[PDB]
Every structure is written in C-alpha cells, then in structure tokens.
C-alpha cells in the first residue's frame, strides 16, 4: 500500500522444540570371538 | 528285457557322473546345490 505502512507482527506457532522420540533397536549381532579378532554377523532390519 | 527271443542288457559305466551334489535343496520345482546345515546347526539369517 501507499497510504500508511501501519505495520505489526504476529507470532509463528508450531515452533521446533525438544522431546523424546522412539527409535528402533537393531537386531542383535552375533559376536564370534577369535584370537585377537572379533567376528560380527549382522542382520539389519533397516539401514544401520 | 526280452521281446521275441532276444535278451538285451544295458550298462553299466555311464561315466559315473552326476550334477547333483551331496547337498540338495528343492523349492518350487527348482533344485539348488546349497550346503545346508544339519538339524541343529542352523543359524539366524541363513537357510535353516
């Protein structure tokens, strides 16, 4: 407009706050020992 | 075998070959030479 720039401000809701969220727990790995070596058999449900 | 007085006898020693390896898996009409583990050595994430 051109009459008057009668301006003001209003609040944005839905801000980004902290919180606790639930994450998957991967399938358990199989740890076969060996002399100065660990061996891991892994079977992911999802990209891990 | 015997037809009209003849006696026919076939074999042996057809080169003693087989494709069928010692361990076979059958699925949907298809046959595979997999090294399947015995009953009680099957591990998770594997056939057995």
User: Does the beta-carbon distance from B43 to A30 stay under 8 Å?
Assistant: yes
Could you tell me which chain A residue has the CA closest to the CA of B46? A43
Q: Which two tokens stand for residue A9?
A: 């401000």
Technique used to solve these coordinates? cryo-EM
Alpha-carbon span A8 to A4, nearest angstrom: 12
Between CA B48 and CA B38 the distance in angstroms is: 8
In whole angstroms, what is the distance from residue A7 CA to residue A37 CA?
Answer: 69
Q: Coil, strand or helix: which one is A17? A: coil
Written as six digits, the tokens of B12 are 């042996």
Is there a contact between A43 and B43 if contact means CB atoms under 8 Å apart? Answer: no
Which residue's structure tokens are 């390896």? B21
Residue A21 C-alpha from the chain's centroid: 8
Give the closest-approach CA distance of A41 to chain B in angstroms.
9
Angstrom distance (rounded) from CA B39 to CA B21:
19
- The reply to whether A45 touches chain B by the CB within 8 Å rule is no
């Amino acid at each position: 407009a051109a009459g008057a720039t009668l301006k003001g401000k209003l609040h944005v809701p839905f801000l980004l706050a902290d919180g606790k969220c639930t994450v998957p727990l991967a399938p358990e790995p199989m740890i076969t020992f060996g002399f100065r070596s660990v061996s891991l058999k892994l079977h992911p449900k999802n990209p891990t | 075998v015997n037809f009209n007085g003849v006696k026919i006898t076939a074999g042996p020693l057809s080169t003693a070959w087989t494709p069928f390896d010692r361990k076979i898996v059958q699925y949907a009409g298809e046959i595979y030479n997999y090294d399947f583990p015995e009953y009680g050595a099957g591990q998770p994430g594997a056939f057995g």
